[PDB]
């Protein structure tokens, strides 16, 4: 959420502008839970999955501040309890 | 406040059902369509558009029904006729010359040579002759009749190619449809509905039309006699 200048000129009109991420519908597979979740994911999330070399690695390596999703924390907590138990 | 639509009945019944007018107000409560409201109270008759509907799935063969009476329907501009067969009754749109004590045949068997076209029979477009007048056109198999239901409106079949029928709508626009769709042969009743003359302003209020607004709007560029080529044929056949 923010403002912008038309024509990228300072002396121009000030305009309210909202930028929204492009959402995609994908289903992901987790080895720890062996269940498929249809989760609204973004292209950045998929890149982070490949960067961590695994969907479970992405959840278990990224901290809370990086994830910013209650579903992710519950997904981590479900798998974290699975390993400990 | 959100309102509730009066279309809450779930089971089909031949008896008239209660009807509540809208007046152009949407569910929110604001005017969306002007010039509607303040009409005479009306009751709605449950009209069965799907001509071919067996009573039970045990015997899917063609069945023949009998016409009891032809009544006047306040909702639509045509005349509906009560039709009974087996253990149920149905309200279907009457053709030009349907009367009491008449027998109507409903069938779907696509025969190779032909089938004689009667004034009330409903046959699939694959069996009708080339030069046949039809109404209550079914756009897709099993969807039901949607097109050509106004008073006096009749479409004419044009040709059947590669197992597909092409018809002419009342708007003189060709339409392509699978030949297995059910259609009714004839012209819709109340032919002289177009020739009816309204004698006074009050009769418009009785029908349920409110007078137009008095604001004087200068004509824009949209006005004027426009000559435009006919749009291309609309086809509902999904080519694989």
């Amino acid at each position: 959420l923010g403002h912008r200048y038309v024509n990228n000129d300072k002396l121009s009109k000030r305009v309210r502008k909202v930028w929204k991420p492009q959402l995609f519908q994908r289903e992901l597979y987790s080895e720890i839970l062996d269940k498929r979740f249809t989760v609204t994911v973004t292209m950045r999330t998929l890149d982070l999955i490949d960067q961590a070399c695994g969907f479970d690695f992405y959840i278990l390596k990224t901290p809370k501040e990086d994830l910013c999703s209650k579903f992710g924390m519950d997904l981590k907590r479900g798998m974290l309890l699975r390993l400990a138990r | 406040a959100t309102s509730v639509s009066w279309k809450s009945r779930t089971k089909y019944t031949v008896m008239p059902v209660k009807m509540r007018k809208s007046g152009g107000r949407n569910h929110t409560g604001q005017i969306q369509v002007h010039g509607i409201g303040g009409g005479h109270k009306q009751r709605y008759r449950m009209i069965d558009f799907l001509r071919f509907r067996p009573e039970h799935e045990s015997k899917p063969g063609p069945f023949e029904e009998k016409v009891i009476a032809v009544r006047y329907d306040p909702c639509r501009s045509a005349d509906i006729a009560l039709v009974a067969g087996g253990n149920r009754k149905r309200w279907i749109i009457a053709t030009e010359n349907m009367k009491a004590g008449d027998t109507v045949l409903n069938s779907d068997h696509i025969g190779r040579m032909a089938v004689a076209a009667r004034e009330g029979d409903a046959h699939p477009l694959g069996a009708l002759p080339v030069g046949t007048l039809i109404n209550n056109v079914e756009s897709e198999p099993g969807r039901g009749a949607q097109y050509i239901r106004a008073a006096g409106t009749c479409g004419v079949l044009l040709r059947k190619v590669n197992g597909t029928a092409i018809i002419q709508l009342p708007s003189k626009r060709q339409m392509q449809v699978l030949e297995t769709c059910i259609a009714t042969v004839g012209r819709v009743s109340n032919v002289d509905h177009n020739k009816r003359v309204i004698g006074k302003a009050g009769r418009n209020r009785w029908l349920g039309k409110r007078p137009n607004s008095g604001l004087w709007q200068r004509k824009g560029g949209w006005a004027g006699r426009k000559i435009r080529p006919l749009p291309p044929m609309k086809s509902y056949v999904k080519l694989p």
């Binding site: 269940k35 579903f71 479900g78 309890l81 | 509730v4 639509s5 779930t10 799907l50």
Partner: protein
């Protein structure tokens, strides 16, 4: 065909379950302990109500085939 139901008039379907119930081997945290709604807590799923003692007026109507005189043959009255 043209079914005579209307989406708005028909009873709405139950809301989708929360994501917590989809995670295997994870006990959800619900507000059923405080017996009142609270935002941020998962919606409980309760078993169908089973009154120990049947009440004549307030019980659900018995099925038609439960009647002793129910017969498969269709008789016309």
């Amino acid at each position: 065909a043209y079914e005579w139901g209307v989406r708005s008039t028909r009873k709405p379907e139950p809301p989708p379950l929360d994501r917590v119930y989809e995670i295997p081997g994870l006990e959800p945290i619900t507000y059923a302990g405080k017996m009142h709604f609270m935002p941020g807590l998962a919606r409980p799923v309760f078993p169908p109500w089973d009154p120990g003692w049947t009440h004549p007026k307030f019980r659900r109507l018995p099925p038609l085939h439960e009647h002793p005189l129910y017969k498969d043959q269709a008789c016309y009255v």
